[PDB]
Design a protein around this nucleic acid. Structure first.
Ligand SMILES: [Zn+2]
Lengths: 189, 139, 120, 143, 54, 72
RNA sequence: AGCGUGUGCCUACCCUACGCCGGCAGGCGCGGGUAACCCGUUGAACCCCAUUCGUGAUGGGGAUCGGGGAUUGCAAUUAUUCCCCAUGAACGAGGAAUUCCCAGUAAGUGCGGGUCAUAAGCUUGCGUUGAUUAAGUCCCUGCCCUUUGUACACACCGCCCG
């Protein structure tokens, strides 16, 4: 009954990991017609787990200073990306979003301990909510950094990393940061 | 035989007129499709794409709106459409149908019946805005 | 020599409201608002220095404070001295400065040559 | 919108090596004295479409856009477009082009340096002319 | 010295207005027709009725 | 390195434009400029004749984005 | 959109609709308003929708300069501001170091007020669009309380030994 941008439905989207099931939104009742909702998700801790992750990606799309208020700009970037994704793959374009958020977030970080200039870190776990928070950050800055001085638009540069993170490729900027954030993490352990 | 309710966001006040009609929902004398931010056309059409055209087939909605901006007037129109249909079903239909409308409208998004009460804070001296402060220097 | 395509000899008998159509906009507006009571008495002083000057000799230097005086084309050749805040500096009027102010020929300051820097 | 073949890749107009593959309105900009605004007016006065680039132009429309830069006042281009409106010597309305822009503003500057004026001397010392402050800025290239 | 000393045109500008109690010319509040100094307004504010609410 | 492109149609690249551009499943003015090494205005305008050719479907038209796919 | 301001003791000094003439900055009349009565439905800017441009010191960026034109003033030269051509530099996201901030917030984006004959890159308010991250600690910088060491107390910027 509820299709995102009136065309993409949510019933066949299947989250893989159990670590991210209670945190990554829409499958059932977070189905919205548009990513724009204008809701008070930052009013309490953990409340933003119950917001549709399409709105999460839209909100982190506008990060740099010249685009900081523009939500109607970034929702059409995501809408135009959800056409290029479907053309280059051929399936529902929401399953690739949860395939990208599952794949991109690290699972072992390093916490900084030392003195003024001295760095002797130590490896810790990663909470799955910080995994969801750092999935979308790496995706969006990969789309941002590889579209800057380039003929490629932001909608193509978002889509060509949002599938490359789902496939687990190491040409995507997101998985290039996750494996190094775990490589320097294992190096202390 | 007529309803007048108001919807409200930051400054906008959309006031919806509901009388017994056929189903021509008009914003300031123009259709819902032609309303200019068409990126949020689905945001405008949520209370009719939810409850179907048949629950709106007996009314006729002329929404006037003034104040705010474009996004704030979209969220004021769709609040007053919902709050107008609910008040029409309370004043000229039974309470049961009002409940069966209200639970779907609340289940989608509560900001279709309850106003969003947050407004802009005041600027203070010492900085560029409410919370932010001017940059300071040392020595 | 000319100025906007007309020689100085027609400028000597160019009328008051017709010379105004050759000037730039500050000077045209200045001639529209009028030359005041202490500016008619300068041109009379330069006439009084001109027709008593010897025919082979430029007139004597005359002292002024009027740094706002526009150089009219009936004021060419005179030795005026426009003040600089301290001294009266000697100015000889040439025909190529006939749209300027008198007060841009006594410099009002010493053009700066620097020394060694102290404690910065 | 087919493959062109008579493609004059470099146009040598007014001793300037302009582009030939830019647009026809922003190729003429590369000469001194024509900005992005003047070229549009002379091209609209020449009755040429501005969709085209610079290499497909027939030589009639190449010469007829240069001859409206040597005397624009016959073609109803008004006086407020011109580079020098009321000249100080002859009082003539003209648009000075690349060969004579330096050769005109040098004489404008040294005209103010024979006169020993507050602006020609300010140009002669190399300092700022239009009344800017000079304490904290302009430090680049100065010793 | 009759067409002189108070001769200069004081028809506008900073030094044709002065405070109405200080006779001082700097920091002047011309709004609503106060024409007081910014310092002498603060002394007589509660007498005029300007109360500090927020 | 700097990008040398072609402002108008080349004889060889016009063969490249007419046969595998309907064999891409994604045709968009910033992929045609990268593949065939042309400027963006040839990609913007030369593609808009292929819609009139009836060879390439039009998916979405916007100011900052144009998405074309092949038919069938 | 929202907060506002508007003919003034000395005191000159305004908010301006509308018609005509001007590319324009402006110029003429002609009305309203001591104001919820008029400017004013305050027909704001980003935002939104179409065309062009196509990763290059480019049409990004506009500094610095040469000519004109117009207002303000008694006076505009060491450019008061404003308008039109033309010129088209640095700058490719910034080292050591450092600032501010928790929700209609940051940031963007304009608008009023003060200054104001002329005039905002400032400040003071107002709206509009509108997030990421946090819901914690004493690591740093500091404040504080309790025990406690002091040969310190114009008080560690102390007192003092060669
Ligand atoms: Zn006082």
């Amino acid at each position: 009954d509820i299709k995102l941008f009136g065309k993409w439905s949510t019933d066949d989207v299947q989250i893989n990991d159990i670590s991210l099931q209670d945190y990554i939104a829409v499958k059932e009742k977070y189905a919205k017609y548009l990513p724009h909702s204008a809701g008070r998700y930052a009013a309490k801790r953990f409340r933003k787990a119950q917001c549709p992750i399409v709105e999460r990606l839209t909100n982190s799309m506008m990060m740099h200073g010249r685009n900081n208020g523009k939500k109607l700009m970034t929702v059409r970037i995501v809408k135009h990306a959800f056409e290029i994704i479907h053309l280059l793959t051929g399936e529902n374009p929401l399953q690739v979003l949860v395939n990208a958020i599952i794949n991109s977030g690290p699972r072992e970080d390093s916490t900084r301990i030392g003195r003024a200039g001295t760095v002797r870190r130590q490896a810790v776990d990663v909470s799955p909510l910080r995994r969801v928070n750092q999935a979308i950050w790496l995706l969006c800055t990969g789309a941002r950094e590889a579209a800057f001085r380039n003929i490629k638009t932001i909608a193509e540069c978002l889509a060509d990393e949002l599938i490359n993170a789902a496939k687990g490729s190491s040409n995507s900027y997101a998985i290039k940061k996750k494996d190094e954030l775990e490589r320097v993490a294992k190096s202390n352990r | 035989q007529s309803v007048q309710v108001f919807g409200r966001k930051k400054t906008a006040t959309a006031v919806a007129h509901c009388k017994r009609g056929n189903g021509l929902i008009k914003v300031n004398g123009r259709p819902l499709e032609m309303i200019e931010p068409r990126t949020l056309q689905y945001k405008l059409l949520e209370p009719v794409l939810l409850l179907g055209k048949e629950r709106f087939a007996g009314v006729d909605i002329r929404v006037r709106v003034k104040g705010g901006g474009h996004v704030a007037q979209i969220y004021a129109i769709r609040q007053s459409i919902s709050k107008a249909l609910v008040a029409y079903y309370q004043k000229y239909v039974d309470e049961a149908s009002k409940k069966e409308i209200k639970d779907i409208l609340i289940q989608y998004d509560r900001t279709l019946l309850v106003a969003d009460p947050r407004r802009c804070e005041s600027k203070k001296f010492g900085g560029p805005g409410a919370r932010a402060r001017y940059q300071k220097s040392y020595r | 020599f000319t100025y906007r395509g007309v020689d100085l000899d027609q400028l000597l008998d160019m009328s008051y409201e017709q010379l105004m159509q050759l000037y730039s906009a500050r000077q045209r507006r200045r001639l529209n608002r009028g030359l005041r009571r202490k500016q008619h008495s300068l041109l009379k002083r330069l006439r009084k220095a001109k027709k008593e000057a010897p025919p082979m000799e430029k007139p004597e230097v005359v002292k002024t404070h009027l740094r706002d005086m526009i150089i009219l084309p009936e004021m060419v050749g005179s030795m005026v001295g426009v003040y600089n805040g301290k001294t009266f500096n000697q100015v000889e009027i040439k025909p190529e400065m006939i749209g300027h102010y008198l007060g841009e020929f006594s410099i009002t300051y010493k053009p700066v040559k620097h020394g060694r820097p102290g404690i910065g | 919108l087919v493959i062109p073949e008579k493609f004059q890749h470099i146009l040598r107009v007014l001793n300037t090596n302009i582009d030939g593959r830019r647009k026809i309105a922003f190729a003429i900009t590369a000469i001194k004295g024509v900005g992005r605004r003047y070229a549009h007016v002379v091209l609209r006065k020449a009755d040429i479409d501005l969709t085209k680039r610079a290499g497909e132009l027939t030589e009639d429309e190449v010469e007829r856009v240069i001859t409206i830069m040597q005397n624009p006042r016959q073609y109803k281009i008004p006086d407020w477009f011109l580079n020098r409106q009321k000249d100080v010597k002859d009082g003539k309305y003209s648009q000075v082009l690349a060969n004579g822009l330096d050769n005109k503003l040098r004489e404008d500057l040294e005209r103010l340096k024979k006169i020993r004026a507050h602006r020609g001397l300010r140009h002669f010392w190399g300092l700022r002319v239009r009344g800017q402050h000079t304490k904290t800025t302009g430090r680049r290239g100065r010793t | 010295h009759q067409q002189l000393y108070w001769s200069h045109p004081r028809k506008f500008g900073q030094g044709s207005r002065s405070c109405r109690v200080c006779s001082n010319r700097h920091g002047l509040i011309r709004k609503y027709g106060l024409n007081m100094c910014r310092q002498c307004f603060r002394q007589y504010a509660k007498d005029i009725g300007f109360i500090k609410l927020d | 390195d700097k990008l040398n492109n072609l402002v108008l149609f080349d004889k060889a690249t016009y063969d490249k434009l007419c046969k595998e551009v309907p064999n891409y499943k994604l045709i968009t003015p910033a992929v045609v400029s990268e593949r065939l090494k042309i400027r963006g205005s040839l990609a913007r305008a030369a593609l808009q004749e292929l819609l009139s050719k009836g060879l390439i479907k039009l998916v979405s038209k916007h100011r900052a984005q144009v998405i074309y796919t092949r038919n069938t």
